[model samples]
Target: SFTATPGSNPNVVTLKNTSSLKLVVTWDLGNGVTAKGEEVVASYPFANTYTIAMTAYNTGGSTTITQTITIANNDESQIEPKAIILAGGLTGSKTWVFDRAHDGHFGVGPGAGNPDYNGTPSWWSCPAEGKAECALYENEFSFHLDGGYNMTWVNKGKIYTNGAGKDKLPGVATVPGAGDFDVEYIPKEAYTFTVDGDKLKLSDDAFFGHFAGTSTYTIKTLNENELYLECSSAVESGNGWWYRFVPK
Candidate 1:
């Protein structure tokens, strides 16, 4: 949880001058945390315990430099070097509550439970792998089930953003499935909140079968923690969302 050691300093590096002159950062946190550095060279960790090795290059030759650095996390509470992705495949708007300060929902990526790889981490980097430029979705979208109509719909979703820079969420179709490897939130310039009032009304499409009309969202079960909502409302509202989690 504390320290990490990224091998030794004197690792041999060979490269062509005219090629992509890049940088390679290494670290030694010193605890069971072993190491977490960037191999791409251009991007490296901001904080470190000892000196970080660096190389400068041109079309002619190159030079190496080593200097002491500081190791720190983007936020005090964020678990350093861990990737956080979206789970369950359900997406809408995103937001965050930093130390109780509520804002908007932000974009989160697909998360992997136990993906193994031979390279660094062998898995995807997410919530845990962010540095200073981390993507945090502070504005999450809200969803509601049209109980009386027996349909699922997106209430006020797609609260998008490109962080403090741009105000928009990138649009993408929701992939159908379950597990950690699903769409959470993501980076974007603009987005389309499909959870809308359109196509949610009773139409031709509904879950599994055809809803003639006037079907209600059957509240199959209810509990304080979770509830089950299934409806025969219109799958394609022809107006709103086609699905909803009905409350008993």
Candidate 2:
């Protein structure tokens, strides 16, 4: 006996051998097509019902069975991607950080942790010459399955900077400064999001101050211990970005 299911291509059906004998079998995939194997693959190149017949021979006795398979389309993409993520699995909070680190330099705060304090990486060309602060390297990002996210940067110094002068944030700084007018305490920003298959869409346009529009990323890989997301700027500029992180 055998069963047919959709394969990589809709027109291509994967035949599964289901028999107690566990012996090799022959398959007749209709349309004047035939195959001989335990598990057979047949391509029709057209969408229609195809009766798949299977036969097995043994010293005891021979048996035969048939199954009907229907092809839906020639292109597999016509079928929407499966919903692989479950809300229950994503409940609570998941923290992630930048994956790779650049070389650290002296005379820089957290000198040993700064990636590009001395010079900018070939891959990254920032106008400020380097990041405004290193404390951000230790920042943590949280994604909540309940349509919420948190941006938490440890309370260290002026964590937010912007523009050509690296001013203390522009238009979005709400955290209060410490004595002597220092932005000592860290701040957390709230945002909403939705996950569609492999895409994560953010409600905030400038959640990270990097995106000019709604931020979205293609989740290339995700598991209990690791996550890899690929993102592109809102505008097409021949560049892309990758972010990797692990559960905190």
Candidate 3:
């Protein structure tokens, strides 16, 4: 059995397991907040009824139960609102440029099963203005939250692509040396974007500065001025790409 009581802070609750069963307990706080332990604190950012699921596991098996709790007032300090404000500003639209001056602005490392995977680039780090010849620094990507989450890529008539990803762009001639190319191209349509949890997904195969044959990117960090992203290459398995952007 479990009990729920008012926490120290407003819109917060303390959930505790009262039974002594030598079991490990976990709580799914129903608002994307989860915890494991005999007792845990859950903070609600919005006023609503939420179902909290508690699961107990032992050597033999596991059991689950759920309880409903209502939050009377909304918590003014929430991460989602701050993220939106920082990403798109109050106007709901923002343009981002590659932070070429910063190291690791564009890089690749192991995809998974490595310490560097999904972190910073361990294999290689691009020096400041390292890709000046590719016209990559000239690209601009705009995110609009006004009418749904939309994205527009302004490539200024050219884009940089990975060698393995060259074929993904039809009619773009293959280039020598590692298959990387700075080719002329223009976006054919407007794309959409969604920020769910830590993942930022681009619709219709849309991508950032470098095309790595993938549309989904993990948002590692996003603040008022910087946006850091990482994603595994679809064409090149076992490798992940990193990108950093600043307000344009």
Candidate 4:
């Protein structure tokens, strides 16, 4: 058996297999797209009823099932086409730098449930250019739509990290400091970005200004000149971290 459910947004759907037997499953999402896995997420750009087909194969035989999903609205802003324009720019690519001049350029606060859970950081906020000593302020993040959705981290020759992030870097030694610090290293130029609902996910080891042990970030805001993001740290013992960036 299989299950179909609404995803993070109106035009997206998540499909999952609930069969007891071991089988290879494939999904035909009725949007001219096919996927293979026990679970898969698909996006339909328009409001319509889509007939979905699921096929499973076992050692003995194969089985196929069909279902229908109805999308309520066509939210253009929630999909990749609109997002890539804002992030990557109309020219197909854009470079961004930390909005160091703004208050709370980087901050940490409680997650979404608690009373103190505000989208912007309230626990600790990084003042304008407060983290200048680290390598964060000068780094540039480039997003491109030319060759799919690719990204590159231009960190000169070093990167900044906290205590928890220090451990995640392989072969990189720890820096002596009580708080955030910078280290010598070269970053990979080939990275990819994905616009999933309101989330921006980075592929490979590429990260934003700080190494927070997670590549997925909530796109709190995105415009022609500003980009705001928030994400929970897998390493640090906090609710989440927020970052703000501007066009370079």
- The TM-scores, one per candidate, come to 0.16, 0.37, 0.62, 0.63
Point out the higher-scoring one by lDDT: 2 or 4: 4
> Which candidate should be chosen as best, given TM-score against the real structure?
4
Question: How many clashes does each candidate structure show, in the order listed?
Answer: 61, 0, 1, 0
Stretches of candidate 4 exceeding 4 Å from the true structure: 1-79, 86-92, 113-116, 171-179
Estimate candidate 1's alpha-carbon lDDT, on a 0 to 1 scale: 0.24
Model 1 TM-score relative to the real fold: 0.16
Over the stretch 1-248, how does candidate 4's per-residue lDDT look in tens digits? 88888867867788999887768999999988999999999887656689989999878787899988887655556447745654464334688998988788888898554466767688889988788766777678887644245687887676777767777776454453324666566778688778877888888856786877888888888887788889888776556888998888
Which pairs of residues have clashing backbones in candidate 2?
A: none
Clashing pairs in 3: 163-179
Which clashing pairs does model 4 show?
none
Name the TM-score of candidate 4.
Answer: 0.63
lDDT of 3 by residue, 135-206 (tens): 577788887544345678887776787767777777454453333686667775687777778878878777
When summed lDDT is taken over every stretch of 10 residues in candidate 1, the lowest stretch is 80-89
- Clash count, candidate 4: 0
Better of 1 and 3 by lDDT: 3
C-alpha RMSD for every candidate = 22.6, 15.6, 10.2, 10.1
Which tens-of-lDDT digit does each residue in 1-248 have in candidate 1?
A: 11223332212122122324344333332222223344322212222244444444456665654544333321213212111111111222222111112111111221112132121211222232121122122222222211111222221222222222121213332322211111233323222222221122222322211111332333333332222223321222221111112112
lDDT, model 3, position 136:
72
lDDT of 2 at 8: 57
Candidate 2 lDDT over residue span 2-40, tens digit each: 678776566677887877555768888885888888777
